[PDB]
Amino acid sequence: VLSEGEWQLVLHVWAKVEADVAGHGQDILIRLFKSHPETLEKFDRFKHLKTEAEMKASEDLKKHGVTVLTALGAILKKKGHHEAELKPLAQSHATKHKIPIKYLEFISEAIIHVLHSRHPGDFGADAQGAMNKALELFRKDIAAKYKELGYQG
Ligand code: HEM
């Protein structure tokens, strides 16, 4: 359970992401894909991208980054009352896209990285800890729905 203080740190930094959702979305997906190449293989859409330059030139990758961050933003702004928003996301990522929970850990790390790079004055250690807790809560609750469906492993 995050506290109200910790939610405020999280959503203070997130409001700054909302000024440039596409740029953030691109940097995070590129970092995920470079740090953890296995994750790119889950996207038939992107698996032709062999260089960081080709990834940064891809409009379709930048489109997907906005889709991911708008959905994450929607869940963060529920401050933990996010069951309606997580159900479909867990359902599709377990059963259709086949994404292990650990790759959700990876993209959490890439999101923390990108926010520290772009918003260092709003993303000190308090706010880093709080964002980590929010992202853990997202992963806990998706993992519980994986388990229900037979995909926690
Ligand atoms: C913050 C974590 C994430 C969020 C909020 C998220 C959000 C989304 C949304 C909103 C969609 C499209 C709607 C849907 O299919 O449910 C999507 C599609 C997809 N996601 Fe995620 N995603 C996350 C993490 C990941 C990770 C870690 C992977 C892969 C490693 C991944 C792989 C996919 C794939 C393969 C699609 C289908 C893309 C396509 O071919 O159109 N997701 N995601």
mmCIF file of all heavy atoms in Angstrom, residues 32 39 42-43 45 64 67-68 71-72 88-89 92-93 97 99 103-104 107 111 138, ligand 1:
data_model
loop_
_atom_site.group_PDB
_atom_site.id
_atom_site.type_symbol
_atom_site.label_atom_id
_atom_site.label_comp_id
_atom_site.label_asym_id
_atom_site.label_seq_id
_atom_site.Cartn_x
_atom_site.Cartn_y
_atom_site.Cartn_z
ATOM 1 N N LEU A 32 14.487 -0.720 -22.972
ATOM 2 C CA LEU A 32 14.057 -2.105 -22.628
ATOM 3 C C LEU A 32 14.766 -2.969 -23.703
ATOM 4 O O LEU A 32 15.265 -4.094 -23.401
ATOM 5 C CB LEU A 32 12.533 -2.222 -22.841
ATOM 6 C CG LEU A 32 11.825 -3.595 -22.677
ATOM 7 C CD1 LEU A 32 12.173 -4.056 -21.207
ATOM 8 C CD2 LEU A 32 10.421 -3.535 -22.935
ATOM 9 N N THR A 39 13.207 -9.088 -25.043
ATOM 10 C CA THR A 39 11.905 -8.517 -25.061
ATOM 11 C C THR A 39 11.491 -8.078 -26.447
ATOM 12 O O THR A 39 10.317 -8.156 -26.767
ATOM 13 C CB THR A 39 11.897 -7.292 -24.105
ATOM 14 O OG1 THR A 39 12.817 -6.314 -24.547
ATOM 15 C CG2 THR A 39 12.175 -7.722 -22.676
ATOM 16 N N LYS A 42 9.380 -10.507 -28.579
ATOM 17 C CA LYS A 42 7.917 -10.637 -28.332
ATOM 18 C C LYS A 42 7.057 -9.764 -29.267
ATOM 19 O O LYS A 42 5.827 -9.916 -29.291
ATOM 20 C CB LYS A 42 7.614 -10.250 -26.844
ATOM 21 C CG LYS A 42 8.127 -11.322 -25.863
ATOM 22 C CD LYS A 42 7.345 -12.680 -26.004
ATOM 23 C CE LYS A 42 7.962 -13.694 -24.971
ATOM 24 N NZ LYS A 42 7.118 -14.951 -24.934
ATOM 25 N N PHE A 43 7.727 -8.820 -29.976
ATOM 26 C CA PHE A 43 6.969 -7.948 -30.885
ATOM 27 C C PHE A 43 7.260 -8.289 -32.363
ATOM 28 O O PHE A 43 8.314 -7.869 -32.935
ATOM 29 C CB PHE A 43 7.437 -6.476 -30.749
ATOM 30 C CG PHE A 43 7.083 -5.860 -29.359
ATOM 31 C CD1 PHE A 43 7.917 -6.001 -28.226
ATOM 32 C CD2 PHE A 43 5.911 -5.036 -29.276
ATOM 33 C CE1 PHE A 43 7.555 -5.358 -26.956
ATOM 34 C CE2 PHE A 43 5.545 -4.469 -27.982
ATOM 35 C CZ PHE A 43 6.454 -4.622 -26.888
ATOM 36 N N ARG A 45 5.950 -6.936 -34.694
ATOM 37 C CA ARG A 45 5.831 -5.523 -35.220
ATOM 38 C C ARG A 45 7.303 -4.946 -35.316
ATOM 39 O O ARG A 45 7.517 -3.992 -36.097
ATOM 40 C CB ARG A 45 5.112 -4.704 -34.025
ATOM 41 C CG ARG A 45 4.101 -3.801 -34.483
ATOM 42 C CD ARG A 45 3.213 -3.226 -33.424
ATOM 43 N NE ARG A 45 2.894 -1.780 -33.659
ATOM 44 C CZ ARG A 45 2.129 -1.050 -32.818
ATOM 45 N NH1 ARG A 45 1.609 -1.657 -31.696
ATOM 46 N NH2 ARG A 45 1.863 0.265 -33.107
ATOM 47 N N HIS A 64 3.689 3.024 -30.332
ATOM 48 C CA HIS A 64 3.411 2.070 -29.261
ATOM 49 C C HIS A 64 3.846 2.593 -27.900
ATOM 50 O O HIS A 64 3.265 2.210 -26.887
ATOM 51 C CB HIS A 64 4.108 0.678 -29.555
ATOM 52 C CG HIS A 64 3.410 -0.399 -28.768
ATOM 53 N ND1 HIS A 64 2.033 -0.614 -28.903
ATOM 54 C CD2 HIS A 64 3.837 -1.242 -27.787
ATOM 55 C CE1 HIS A 64 1.667 -1.554 -28.029
ATOM 56 N NE2 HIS A 64 2.738 -1.958 -27.367
ATOM 57 N N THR A 67 1.004 4.408 -26.574
ATOM 58 C CA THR A 67 -0.029 3.492 -26.017
ATOM 59 C C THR A 67 0.319 2.926 -24.658
ATOM 60 O O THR A 67 -0.526 2.826 -23.767
ATOM 61 C CB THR A 67 -0.117 2.293 -27.006
ATOM 62 O OG1 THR A 67 -0.594 2.867 -28.236
ATOM 63 C CG2 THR A 67 -1.181 1.293 -26.412
ATOM 64 N N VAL A 68 1.567 2.463 -24.519
ATOM 65 C CA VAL A 68 1.963 1.919 -23.195
ATOM 66 C C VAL A 68 1.924 2.957 -22.083
ATOM 67 O O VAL A 68 1.391 2.668 -21.031
ATOM 68 C CB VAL A 68 3.376 1.281 -23.372
ATOM 69 C CG1 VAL A 68 3.994 0.910 -22.018
ATOM 70 C CG2 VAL A 68 3.377 0.181 -24.499
ATOM 71 N N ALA A 71 -1.581 3.966 -20.967
ATOM 72 C CA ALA A 71 -2.209 2.981 -20.121
ATOM 73 C C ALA A 71 -1.585 2.981 -18.807
ATOM 74 O O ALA A 71 -2.281 2.871 -17.773
ATOM 75 C CB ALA A 71 -2.107 1.662 -20.775
ATOM 76 N N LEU A 72 -0.284 3.057 -18.710
ATOM 77 C CA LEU A 72 0.326 3.159 -17.345
ATOM 78 C C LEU A 72 -0.145 4.408 -16.600
ATOM 79 O O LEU A 72 -0.337 4.365 -15.342
ATOM 80 C CB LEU A 72 1.842 3.092 -17.500
ATOM 81 C CG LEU A 72 2.614 3.134 -16.175
ATOM 82 C CD1 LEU A 72 2.359 1.849 -15.276
ATOM 83 C CD2 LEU A 72 4.079 3.063 -16.635
ATOM 84 N N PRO A 88 -7.863 -6.116 -18.185
ATOM 85 C CA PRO A 88 -7.666 -6.478 -19.567
ATOM 86 C C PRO A 88 -6.244 -6.526 -19.967
ATOM 87 O O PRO A 88 -5.916 -7.280 -20.888
ATOM 88 C CB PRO A 88 -8.366 -5.415 -20.384
ATOM 89 C CG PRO A 88 -8.808 -4.437 -19.336
ATOM 90 C CD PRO A 88 -8.792 -4.953 -17.999
ATOM 91 N N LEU A 89 -5.412 -5.720 -19.299
ATOM 92 C CA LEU A 89 -4.010 -5.684 -19.615
ATOM 93 C C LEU A 89 -3.416 -6.991 -19.197
ATOM 94 O O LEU A 89 -2.564 -7.635 -19.962
ATOM 95 C CB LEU A 89 -3.452 -4.516 -18.882
ATOM 96 C CG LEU A 89 -2.005 -4.292 -19.113
ATOM 97 C CD1 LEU A 89 -2.044 -3.650 -20.516
ATOM 98 C CD2 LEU A 89 -1.299 -3.340 -18.120
ATOM 99 N N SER A 92 -4.523 -9.805 -21.734
ATOM 100 C CA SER A 92 -3.913 -9.848 -23.008
ATOM 101 C C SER A 92 -2.444 -10.131 -22.935
ATOM 102 O O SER A 92 -1.929 -10.929 -23.733
ATOM 103 C CB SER A 92 -4.156 -8.449 -23.707
ATOM 104 O OG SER A 92 -3.285 -7.460 -23.091
ATOM 105 N N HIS A 93 -1.754 -9.597 -21.917
ATOM 106 C CA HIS A 93 -0.330 -9.898 -21.868
ATOM 107 C C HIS A 93 -0.015 -11.339 -21.412
ATOM 108 O O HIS A 93 0.967 -11.902 -21.901
ATOM 109 C CB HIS A 93 0.355 -8.916 -20.958
ATOM 110 C CG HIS A 93 0.508 -7.570 -21.618
ATOM 111 N ND1 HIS A 93 -0.618 -6.830 -21.983
ATOM 112 C CD2 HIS A 93 1.618 -6.909 -22.092
ATOM 113 C CE1 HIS A 93 -0.206 -5.708 -22.601
ATOM 114 N NE2 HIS A 93 1.130 -5.718 -22.643
ATOM 115 N N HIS A 97 -0.224 -11.966 -25.746
ATOM 116 C CA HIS A 97 1.143 -11.575 -26.057
ATOM 117 C C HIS A 97 2.248 -12.397 -25.456
ATOM 118 O O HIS A 97 3.464 -12.443 -25.912
ATOM 119 C CB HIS A 97 1.405 -10.129 -25.550
ATOM 120 C CG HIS A 97 0.394 -9.146 -26.031
ATOM 121 N ND1 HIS A 97 -0.148 -9.197 -27.328
ATOM 122 C CD2 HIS A 97 -0.275 -8.174 -25.377
ATOM 123 C CE1 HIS A 97 -1.124 -8.312 -27.432
ATOM 124 N NE2 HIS A 97 -1.233 -7.650 -26.261
ATOM 125 N N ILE A 99 3.688 -12.521 -22.278
ATOM 126 C CA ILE A 99 4.838 -11.746 -21.712
ATOM 127 C C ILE A 99 5.037 -12.269 -20.308
ATOM 128 O O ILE A 99 4.117 -12.205 -19.464
ATOM 129 C CB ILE A 99 4.397 -10.191 -21.645
ATOM 130 C CG1 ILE A 99 3.970 -9.716 -23.074
ATOM 131 C CG2 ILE A 99 5.567 -9.418 -20.985
ATOM 132 C CD1 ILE A 99 5.053 -10.068 -24.134
ATOM 133 N N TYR A 103 9.497 -9.843 -17.539
ATOM 134 C CA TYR A 103 9.803 -8.751 -18.491
ATOM 135 C C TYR A 103 9.037 -7.412 -18.041
ATOM 136 O O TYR A 103 9.429 -6.294 -18.389
ATOM 137 C CB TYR A 103 9.174 -9.065 -19.877
ATOM 138 C CG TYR A 103 9.899 -10.155 -20.636
ATOM 139 C CD1 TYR A 103 10.778 -10.991 -20.061
ATOM 140 C CD2 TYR A 103 9.548 -10.374 -21.916
ATOM 141 C CE1 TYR A 103 11.395 -12.125 -20.792
ATOM 142 C CE2 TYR A 103 10.143 -11.351 -22.648
ATOM 143 C CZ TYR A 103 11.021 -12.232 -22.077
ATOM 144 O OH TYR A 103 11.540 -13.213 -22.908
ATOM 145 N N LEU A 104 8.019 -7.571 -17.154
ATOM 146 C CA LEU A 104 7.444 -6.428 -16.552
ATOM 147 C C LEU A 104 8.395 -5.836 -15.575
ATOM 148 O O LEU A 104 8.426 -4.582 -15.416
ATOM 149 C CB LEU A 104 6.117 -6.689 -15.845
ATOM 150 C CG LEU A 104 5.130 -7.213 -16.768
ATOM 151 C CD1 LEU A 104 3.772 -7.290 -15.803
ATOM 152 C CD2 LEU A 104 4.710 -6.357 -18.055
ATOM 153 N N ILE A 107 10.708 -3.764 -17.847
ATOM 154 C CA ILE A 107 10.305 -2.467 -18.353
ATOM 155 C C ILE A 107 10.163 -1.481 -17.154
ATOM 156 O O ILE A 107 10.325 -0.230 -17.291
ATOM 157 C CB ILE A 107 9.014 -2.610 -19.151
ATOM 158 C CG1 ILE A 107 8.770 -1.294 -19.929
ATOM 159 C CG2 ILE A 107 7.795 -2.775 -18.207
ATOM 160 C CD1 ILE A 107 7.590 -1.411 -20.877
ATOM 161 N N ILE A 111 11.624 2.272 -17.218
ATOM 162 C CA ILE A 111 10.864 3.468 -16.868
ATOM 163 C C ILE A 111 11.571 4.273 -15.759
ATOM 164 O O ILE A 111 11.757 5.513 -15.918
ATOM 165 C CB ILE A 111 9.469 3.058 -16.382
ATOM 166 C CG1 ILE A 111 8.614 2.466 -17.453
ATOM 167 C CG2 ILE A 111 8.627 4.273 -15.668
ATOM 168 C CD1 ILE A 111 7.306 1.742 -16.890
ATOM 169 N N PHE A 138 1.912 -2.597 -9.334
ATOM 170 C CA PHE A 138 1.362 -2.993 -10.690
ATOM 171 C C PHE A 138 1.742 -4.427 -10.994
ATOM 172 O O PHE A 138 0.939 -5.216 -11.313
ATOM 173 C CB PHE A 138 2.079 -1.966 -11.706
ATOM 174 C CG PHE A 138 1.900 -2.259 -13.125
ATOM 175 C CD1 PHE A 138 0.777 -1.947 -13.808
ATOM 176 C CD2 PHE A 138 2.911 -2.895 -13.814
ATOM 177 C CE1 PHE A 138 0.686 -2.230 -15.300
ATOM 178 C CE2 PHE A 138 2.803 -3.300 -15.202
ATOM 179 C CZ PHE A 138 1.604 -2.921 -15.895
HETATM 180 C C1 HEM B 1 4.138 -0.897 -18.260
HETATM 181 C C2 HEM B 1 3.960 -2.109 -18.742
HETATM 182 C C3 HEM B 1 2.972 -2.235 -19.913
HETATM 183 C C4 HEM B 1 1.871 -1.599 -20.278
HETATM 184 C C5 HEM B 1 1.139 -0.513 -19.439
HETATM 185 C C6 HEM B 1 1.495 -2.221 -21.531
HETATM 186 C C7 HEM B 1 0.413 -1.733 -22.263
HETATM 187 C C8 HEM B 1 0.019 -2.238 -23.529
HETATM 188 C C9 HEM B 1 -1.274 -1.898 -24.200
HETATM 189 C C10 HEM B 1 -2.231 -0.789 -23.675
HETATM 190 C C11 HEM B 1 -1.252 -2.649 -25.339
HETATM 191 C C12 HEM B 1 -2.280 -2.716 -26.426
HETATM 192 C C13 HEM B 1 -3.599 -3.207 -25.794
HETATM 193 C C14 HEM B 1 -3.425 -4.712 -25.352
HETATM 194 O O1 HEM B 1 -3.029 -5.545 -26.207
HETATM 195 O O2 HEM B 1 -3.699 -5.103 -24.171
HETATM 196 C C15 HEM B 1 -0.047 -3.434 -25.348
HETATM 197 C C16 HEM B 1 0.302 -4.377 -26.367
HETATM 198 C C17 HEM B 1 1.394 -5.156 -26.406
HETATM 199 N N1 HEM B 1 2.371 -5.285 -25.470
HETATM 200 FE FE1 HEM B 1 2.337 -4.274 -23.666
HETATM 201 N N2 HEM B 1 2.496 -3.127 -21.974
HETATM 202 C C18 HEM B 1 3.383 -3.251 -20.978
HETATM 203 C C19 HEM B 1 4.493 -4.109 -20.998
HETATM 204 C C20 HEM B 1 4.868 -4.950 -22.048
HETATM 205 C C21 HEM B 1 6.110 -5.692 -22.129
HETATM 206 C C22 HEM B 1 7.184 -5.732 -21.058
HETATM 207 C C23 HEM B 1 5.961 -6.323 -23.334
HETATM 208 C C24 HEM B 1 6.919 -7.154 -24.114
HETATM 209 C C25 HEM B 1 8.031 -7.496 -23.623
HETATM 210 C C26 HEM B 1 4.735 -6.040 -24.007
HETATM 211 C C27 HEM B 1 4.388 -6.572 -25.180
HETATM 212 C C28 HEM B 1 3.277 -6.199 -25.799
HETATM 213 C C29 HEM B 1 2.905 -6.665 -27.102
HETATM 214 C C30 HEM B 1 3.691 -7.686 -27.800
HETATM 215 C C31 HEM B 1 1.751 -5.997 -27.514
HETATM 216 C C32 HEM B 1 1.082 -6.144 -28.836
HETATM 217 C C33 HEM B 1 1.768 -5.058 -29.756
HETATM 218 C C34 HEM B 1 1.206 -5.130 -31.152
HETATM 219 O O3 HEM B 1 1.731 -6.041 -31.878
HETATM 220 O O4 HEM B 1 0.297 -4.263 -31.489
HETATM 221 N N3 HEM B 1 4.071 -5.204 -23.085
HETATM 222 N N4 HEM B 1 0.699 -3.245 -24.208
#
